[PDB]
Design a protein around this ligand. Sequence first.
Ligand SMILES: [Ca+2]
Lengths: 105, 15
Amino acid sequence: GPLGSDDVEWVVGKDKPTYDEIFYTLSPVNGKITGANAKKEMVKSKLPNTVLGKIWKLADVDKDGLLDDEEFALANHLIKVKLEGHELPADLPPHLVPPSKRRHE
Amino acid sequence: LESKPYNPFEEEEED
Ligand SMILES: [Ca+2]
């Protein structure tokens, strides 16, 4: 049975180009920045340290400790949501979880 | 295992 492609609306796909540029300015080592790079970026965002921890713990879907361009873009996306006056529901739904981390079966 | 060491904003609390 030929199953179809599940294309969910990952809004970060609209955000990506901008955070991709930022990702490159933090010096992406082997295509993935370390916790230090994004840590100083997060403190530049001028958010409370508690928020940084929450943003990271949600955004880092790999639980790898590093942020690649999609994880980092989610990090920035969530930070922006906070800056917009709102907050993240502490839920990663299908339309926020990147396809790279979408578990099939 | 509850202290998540993968977060640079969660790197140790008081000690
Ligand atoms: Ca990661």
